[PDB]
Amino acid sequence: AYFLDFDERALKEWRKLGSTVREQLKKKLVEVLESPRIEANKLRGMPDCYKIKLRSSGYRLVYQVIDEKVVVFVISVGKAERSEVYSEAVKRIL
């Protein structure tokens, strides 16, 4: 299993999340820690990035897998609408 870390800005997003949505993402995030490279969820663009999707929120969590630190690094949590959550993730990695 992998350890967990958050970007400072991503952790704030996490705590601002509504209760029901956070719990939904939390269950999936905990599953992710057991084995975080889930090829179906791999994001295009820079390597080692994956998403967690909800069927109808439509909130998203973006994380980077960092093997050298055995860590899942949460970089962005927010809305898929207008690709907000994804553009922020790229911005925070650069």
Numbering used by the authors: 2 to 95
From the study:
Two additional crystal structures of isolated RelE further show that the C-terminal helix uses this motif to adopt multiple, defined conformations. The structure of the P21 form was previously resolved at 2.5 Å (Neubauer et al., 2009). The interaction patterns observed between helix α3 and the core domain are identical in the RelE monomer, symmetrical dimer, and one molecule of the asymmetrical dimer, whereas they differ in the other molecule.
The bacterial relBE locus encodes a toxin-antitoxin complex in which the toxin, RelE, is capable of cleaving mRNA in the ribosomal A site cotranslationally. The antitoxin, RelB, both binds and inhibits RelE, and regulates transcription through operator binding and conditional cooperativity controlled by RelE. Binding of RelB inhibits RelE by displacement of the C-terminal, flexible α-helix, which contains a tyrosine residue (Tyr87) that is critical for catalysis (Li et al., 2009). RelB is additionally known to dimerize through formation of a ribbon-helix-helix (RHH) DNA binding motif that allows transcriptional autoregulation through binding to the relO operator region (Li et al., 2008; Overgaard et al., 2009).
